[PDB]
């Protein structure tokens, strides 16, 4: 049975070269962003429901205003993932968060699958014209509902709502998961489909390493022999991994350069 240090050594030697990462809310609460269960909502999920949104878009736009860039900064978990990218090891980072902190940490978009979408671009709900996110920032930032300069339809940031298809880039899972030589899961259980069974889609020779509050989800339910769990504070687990990798100095370099620490 593998330990965290064994995984660290597989990475230090390039036995692991093609890392596939999956993240959720657990990597964003250390940036001061809360998790998920008074916005004037009949119930929580209504903020990402299209009918509710057509009847009252203000609560969603209030969230957007709070999540637009400048309110939160990435933390060590994001910066560790940037380091993976910088060291030629990141095949793909699949994220369920919508805070945009992966991009902010400087992981290129081509390495990211923002599976619940993004505020960086928007779409007319009516005629489907696309618009860059900055185009609606003024309006969101002044609490006005943005409207389509052609058809008047509400222009909605490209956050994925309940009942909508995941973004087209989600199709990369068809090729990334068979290609992965290491799967890293940080700060999420992956209880919701499809994320849960993507944990099953790597080959059984592939270590699956979980850094998370607790052991839950398909790694609990269907353990394989090269699974490793590193339970507890996510930040602490990452920093431990960093330290076994010998990347302490590179981490400090990177955090100082990006955030002025």
């Amino acid at each position: 049975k593998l330990s965290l240090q064994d995984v660290a050594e597989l990475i230090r030697a390039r036995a692991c070269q093609r890392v596939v990462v999956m993240v959720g809310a657990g990597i964003s609460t250390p940036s001061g962003i809360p998790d998920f269960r008074q916005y004037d909502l009949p119930y929580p999920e209504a903020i990402f429901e299209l009918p509710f949104f057509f009847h009252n878009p203000k609560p969603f736009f209030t969230l957007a205003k709070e999540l637009y860039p400048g309110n939160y900064k990435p933390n060590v978990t994001h910066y560790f993932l940037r380091l993976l990218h910088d060291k030629g090891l990141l095949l793909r980072l699949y994220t369920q968060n919508i805070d945009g902190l992966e991009r902010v940490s400087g992981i290129p978009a081509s390495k990211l699958v923002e599976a619940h979408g993004t505020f960086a671009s928007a779409t007319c709900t009516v005629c489907q014209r696309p618009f860059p996110g900055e185009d609606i920032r003024a309006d969101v930032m002044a609490d006005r509902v943005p409207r389509c300069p052609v058809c008047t339809g509400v222009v909605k940031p490209d956050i994925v709502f309940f009942g909508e298809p995941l973004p087209q880039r989600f199709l990369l899972h068809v090729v990334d998961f068979p290609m992965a030589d290491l799967l890293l899961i940080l700060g999420t259980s992956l209880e919701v489909e499809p994320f849960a069974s993507l944990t099953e889609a790597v080959r059984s020779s592939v270590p699956r390493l979980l850094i998370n509050r607790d052991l839950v989800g398909p790694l609990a339910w269907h353990p394989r022999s090269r699974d490793v769990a590193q339970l507890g504070d996510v930040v602490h687990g990452v920093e431990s991994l960093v330290e076994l990798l010998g990347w302490t100095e590179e981490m400090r370099d990177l955090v100082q350069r990006e955030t002025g620490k």
Partner: peptide
């Protein structure tokens, strides 16, 4: 097929 895959929907949130």
């Amino acid at each position: 097929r895959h929907k949130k």
